[PDB]
Design goal:
By secondary structure, this protein is mainly beta. 4% of the residues lie in helices and 35% in strands. It binds copper (I) ion. The PDB classes it as electron transport.
Length: 99
């Protein structure tokens, strides 16, 4: 699944922001508008036992040019909440369910 970082009207949103995937499916997060952006999984809001660091950018890491990507595959089933650290309070958050 492809996810835009920033909407095409400049909105600080993941597009889509809520979605479901299967195990091992890749998510390609693509810098689109309003960057810098990153993608950080919430360590307290992912499936027990998952290492947030294996699936996240650090908070200090950034994608800061248009078209740059962050790719991640998820395997463990369950709900994963994530956010863009510099834009979180603006509402740039999401949740992916692996089912
Ligand atoms: Cu962002």
């Amino acid at each position: 699944i492809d996810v835009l970082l920033g909407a095409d009207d400049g909105s600080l949103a993941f597009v889509p922001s809520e979605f479901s995937i299967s195990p091992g499916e890749k998510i390609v997060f693509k810098n689109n508008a309003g960057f810098p952006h990153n993608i950080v999984f919430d360590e307290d809001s992912i499936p027990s036992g998952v290492d947030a660091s294996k699936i996240s950018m650090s908070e200090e890491d950034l994608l800061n040019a248009k078209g740059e990507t962050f790719e991640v595959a998820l395997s463990n089933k369950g709900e994963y909440s994530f956010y863009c650290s510099p834009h979180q309070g603006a509402g740039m958050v999401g949740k992916v369910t692996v089912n």
